Amino acid sequence: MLRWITAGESHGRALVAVVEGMVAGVHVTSADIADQLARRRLGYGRGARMTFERDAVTVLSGIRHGSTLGGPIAIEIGNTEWPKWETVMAADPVDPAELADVARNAPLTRPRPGHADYAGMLKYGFDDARPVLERASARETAARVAAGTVARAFLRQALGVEVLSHVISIGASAPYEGPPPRAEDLPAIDASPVRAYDKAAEADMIAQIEAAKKDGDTLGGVVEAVALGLPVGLGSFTSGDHRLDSQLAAAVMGIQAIKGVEIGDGFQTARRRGSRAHDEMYPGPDGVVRSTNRAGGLEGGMTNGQPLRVRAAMKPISTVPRALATVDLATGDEAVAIHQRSDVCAVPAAGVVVETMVALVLARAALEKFGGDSLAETQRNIAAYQRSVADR
Amino acid sequence: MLRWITAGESHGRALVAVVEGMVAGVHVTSADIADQLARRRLGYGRGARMTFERDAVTVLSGIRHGSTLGGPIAIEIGNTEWPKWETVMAADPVDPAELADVARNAPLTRPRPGHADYAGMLKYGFDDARPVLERASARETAARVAAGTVARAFLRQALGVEVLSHVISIGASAPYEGPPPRAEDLPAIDASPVRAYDKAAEADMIAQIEAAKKDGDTLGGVVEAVALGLPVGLGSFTSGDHRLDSQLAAAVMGIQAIKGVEIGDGFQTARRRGSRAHDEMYPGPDGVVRSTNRAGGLEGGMTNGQPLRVRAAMKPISTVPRALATVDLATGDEAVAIHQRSDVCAVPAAGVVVETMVALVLARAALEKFGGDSLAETQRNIAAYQRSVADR
Amino acid sequence: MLRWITAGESHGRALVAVVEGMVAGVHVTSADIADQLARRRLGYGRGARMTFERDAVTVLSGIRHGSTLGGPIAIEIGNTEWPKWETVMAADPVDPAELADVARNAPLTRPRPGHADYAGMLKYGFDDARPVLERASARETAARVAAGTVARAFLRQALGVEVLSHVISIGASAPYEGPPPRAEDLPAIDASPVRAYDKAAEADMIAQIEAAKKDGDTLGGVVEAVALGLPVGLGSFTSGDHRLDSQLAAAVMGIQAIKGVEIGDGFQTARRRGSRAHDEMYPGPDGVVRSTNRAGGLEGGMTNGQPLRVRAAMKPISTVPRALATVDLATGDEAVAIHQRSDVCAVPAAGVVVETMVALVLARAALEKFGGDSLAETQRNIAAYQRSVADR
Amino acid sequence: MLRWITAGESHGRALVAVVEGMVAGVHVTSADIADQLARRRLGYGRGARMTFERDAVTVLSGIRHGSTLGGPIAIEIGNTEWPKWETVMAADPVDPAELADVARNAPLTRPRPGHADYAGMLKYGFDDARPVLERASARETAARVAAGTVARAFLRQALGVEVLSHVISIGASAPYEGPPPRAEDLPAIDASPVRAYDKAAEADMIAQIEAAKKDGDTLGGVVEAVALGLPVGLGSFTSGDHRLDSQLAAAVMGIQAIKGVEIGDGFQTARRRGSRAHDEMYPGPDGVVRSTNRAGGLEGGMTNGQPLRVRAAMKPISTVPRALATVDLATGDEAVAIHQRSDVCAVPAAGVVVETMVALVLARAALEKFGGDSLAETQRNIAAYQRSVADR
Numbered sequence A, B, C, D: 001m002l003r004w005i006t007a008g009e010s011h012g013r014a015l016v017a018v019v020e021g022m023v024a025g026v027h028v029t030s031a032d033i034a035d036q037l038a039r040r041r042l043g044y045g046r047g048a049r050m051t052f053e054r055d056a057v058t059v060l061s062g063i064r065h066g067s068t069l070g071g072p073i074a075i076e077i078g079n080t081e082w083p084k085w086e087t088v089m090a091a092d093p094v095d096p097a098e099l100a101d102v103a104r105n106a107p108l109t110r111p112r113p114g115h116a117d118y119a120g121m122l123k124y125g126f127d128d129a130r131p132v133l134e135r136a137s138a139r140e141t142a143a144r145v146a147a148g149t150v151a152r153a154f155l156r157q158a159l160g161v162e163v164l165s166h167v168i169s170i171g172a173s174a175p176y177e178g179p180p181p182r183a184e185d186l187p188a189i190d191a192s193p194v195r196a197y198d199k200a201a202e203a204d205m206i207a208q209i210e211a212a213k214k215d216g217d218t219l220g221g222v223v224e225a226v227a228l229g230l231p232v233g234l235g236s237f238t239s240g241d242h243r244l245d246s247q248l249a250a251a252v253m254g255i256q257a258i259k260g261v262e263i264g265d266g267f268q269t270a271r272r273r274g275s276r277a278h279d280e281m282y283p284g285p286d287g288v289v290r291s292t293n294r295a296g297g298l299e300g301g302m303t304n305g306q307p308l309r310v311r312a313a314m315k316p317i318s319t320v321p322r323a324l325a326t327v328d329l330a331t332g333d334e335a336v337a338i339h340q341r342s343d344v345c346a347v348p349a350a351g352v353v354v355e356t357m358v359a360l361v362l363a364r365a366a367l368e369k370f371g372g373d374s375l376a377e378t379q380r381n382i383a384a385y386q387r388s389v390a391d392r
Ligand SMILES: NC(=O)c1cccnc1
Pocket: A040, A049, A138, A139, A141, A255, A256, A257, A317, A346, A349, A350, A353
């Protein structure tokens, strides 16, 4: 089975992604990985969060001469700020007397509302929030995106599938409810300050961000990931855990700051009558065709061949300076929460991470159905299935 | 690790639930299971879907004298309609000539929009939808509820945790946005025709159902499961898959007809400014207290001690008679989809299933943190943790 | 992924096996299951352990008209002795005053050396061994064999693979070290009182059993499972857990009373020089051929196309009357262990269980490589792989 | 759950180990890791396999100031020979014309008997053995040992458990069948050229190696890992996969070149009568005591408190120069296998790897029973269990 794991602290020496169970023969390079990582730098005000200097990407294992080997793929992402943190986040012991004179090593005892700090401190018995926030930080999503690049390459090469995203709403903007983009629209989306597909929505969202920035506040939003070209029959109806919507929901809701996930029209579908809620089927040249995609490409836990549409609701992830009451756990005193990040809105970049998690799940589901140990083998199995479906 | 699996076809001989990894010493009985199963009969018009005769519950393994043994727990739920289906759904071969004279055995070749039928037929290479719909059917949720009863008993006995649900909206009703219920409110909720906690919302929802029923249409809705009494620190921030919101989203989205999941204020949180989106913390007698629960009891992937609130969006699950165009896959001809169920709205009963899936995930997470092989052992570990938290 | 789980107590109402992840379209019937279950009745003196009355087999789910459906397959095996145990092993509470008058309900507080009793009592905090021995009992292997029948059917139909076993040694017999049997030899083996393939070894083993029976003692032995017809490349070298020898060792060592597992010549291979330890390769008509199979069909974690040979060492599983000192945990007093079973040797029947566990692992590994959701799909993928190998 | 994964090719840039699910608060350092890695350099003739220059160890994540953080722990092990391989094993594409002039890049088309080469080439559709041998190589066991160090630290700190190993036999030596060593014996064992605990066996084994070295041959052997101080009740009898012997067998048999695994007296137990096969129990001051440990510390799938003894049979792992016939898969011609390693015997070093795999499994099983997210929490749970057992 395709599996992925991330490791690293935000201010540690490096991040690591390991992907296990990918077939041999998939073409992917360090440049491909760096290109996807660069897409996390996108978005109005993103420079408040990310440093200009790009981190070094190193493929440590599992790829030779631009082709996967079949074994575990380990990718390392450096931390350009490591020299500042090499004592505070040293792996090995440091003289506590030396540490006592390092202002940067001071414990953090005032948990931020909305973050892992409080519950994590209690759970792990930490008197300092540092070990919690270092691992909880959305910097970890860089490692996800490295892993996701492998999944993306597989999906394109094996199935001709493309994954992209666009932003539906930020703050109080009027949601974009038109058709999703296609792959050819990605350049324009990624050139939008808010990674919008619609110009009216783009202007509205930019205005929301400007107003929040002026007020010293922060915003969340809704993003839609779109996967095009999928075959019918990934996922299964045979049990709850095998339903592709279950798997996608796990992967997307597990992203930092995500508080909701929908497939297609989601919560709006729940407000519709059955006569207008579903996608009717009609005869077409090369099989059954639909005129609507309210289902968002999944029915009964499986891909139906329509575009897959997965929406994620992101809470505002940056703590508002001076606004939020908390408690100093060291003393029990009232306190004010201090922020770790200063960006107003991370929704556009969060979209890129949603794409990644969707790609990983889709690649896993494809390998479950089509099997194979090399790309050519998987491709033969796919072709045979496609022929058997066509011959119906 | 706590694990659960369901088996059975809707019209097969019986359903089976197996729960593996529950500690010994949890008090649970066949009567407890039957009581939870009875809660699936709740809801206005539910008798259109469920037969009056109650199915037989049999505990086959893993419980002795009302106490779990520590091994796998297998629960069987009979099918009162089996005599009608004992040939059509016979496990063993039947003379195809005999089968040819059984009208009930006719293949189903007109997939219903919104259901597993089409994709499942293609995926598994079936020329008949029967094997797909028999396993995809929400009758399988009975087996889930049997398993969930074990989880519920554990949560109550080990942690003093209660799980309940109430309905937020059905069709175009105005959503109930007030506080959630407590455990003591469950009798009144379960006595409501729409399992509502609010009388205004109840009337509105009943009206929606009446109008849909008159129009020969069907409805979905939104339900909120609520878990009370949880300790701080179930789930973790250490990776996406360990976040309790990820796990809950998987379990809830994997329920038939669910198209969206939210934690707390979910999608509305994405429309709020950071200054009003989160739950501020204040000093209190026995620790930190909050005045709001916008987070729905989870922050950074972990329980924070507030009520857990998980909302599920359900599409309308019953196919509207004569409304939906489809294709006869045998001929390629246009067709009209024929319904398998006739109930207008299954939202209230679906709430009971959401409760079950939440309970299973919570029990698994509790056993992950607190360990133990017997209830008394787990309880000692819980008490020690609670003391260590209190002593802060 | 193919998964299997067993549930049941020895004296409970029934056993249940559930197999999840088997493809649709595999031909298997209740008669096939009963036939494999009957093979557990084989062996000299087996009637000391098994009652003459055959247990009822019922397929509850996942098979229709003799063909798998693709969903979970649940098989129930009745307990003919249930009426004797229906109070002592009742699932629901019984008046403790009534129980106090039932001699059969007396707690067991004298753990048997060599069994789960002592450690299980301590682990789970039981003051009675009953709940431990009821689940630990090798009666549970009946449920394994039911599950294994599904795996066997798949292996035969998809790959033309056969799994069998023969006994190498019992007690102090001289081990049979000749070639393994082929499928056509199974009738003769199953007709042997000790399921031997060699007549000299058969006589020696029968003599050992006769001597032990006269002395009131018990015996273990060594069995070899053999799987024929496997394709090259099941399992992988990419990590320890993916090595097929790792997976087979887990499955076989997890059988009750097994204390050792070898692949091919195992421990003897460790005593040989490299010049005589391995299987040299030579040109042949339809590919590479070997003249020896010291490796037992696995090299570097993968099938090499030779017969797979897996040997299991079984300790003597029946407690010797009056021989073994133990402690009464209720009092701390010295005691003598009392036996639960009276058979001298269960090695022949244990062989049948080893076959089953090998079949389950092989079926899982085949589905991992070849994928597919229906048998025809898996078969096409297999054929394509076989062609690609042949074309080398 | 505790999980471990390794990544890396033998001649790649680096190896990586990731351990997920270890509690926070375990004291472990890069020096501890390097010390365990150094123990792989032990053994007569080991310098034929390992280069004098020690590889760099870098802890990338999951440990701060010598204490685990609770998140994933990633450890990197450098490759001192990388400059020689940086083109041949480059991750990114290299001009095939440039590669054509690099003798080191020549494909390997003559699979070695006894290795992954042949089956791996066929499985993955490789025309070159290089990608197979690079990942299959026992160099990967360095990454295992890095991960195992974390497990070892946890076992010592949480449970007072020590894991060690000694060599039982090499080639045709007379096996050492005396008592196992204790922790205090490790210095002497690690100072033995063959890591023997017995002086007679040591001399015999050294003689075997000398004779094989003179004859240009290679040897395997048998090693015993010993774990001391374990609590009663790790593992379970509730299913085959939960039996600790199953889990240990998987972990040990998954080590390169291992062809057999035994618990305690293993295969010899299968040749004994029940009256002499098991460990009788007697009253003692602080509980039940045994006078023998034929069981090797496990009964019914669980630790019984005696020393755990796990034996592994290793085939000879280095290919004998000029001895083994194979086939050139490029041409179909007969060929002779060429060796990748030149050491006569790797049994002593293999023992260190067996220790590591045992430690990982034991740590996982301990965390399953005792739970906890920090060491102090786990320790409290352990103490409470120990008290509850003592109070019996
Ligand atoms: N990159 C980010 O800052 C981010 C924040 C939240 C979710 N995903 C990504």
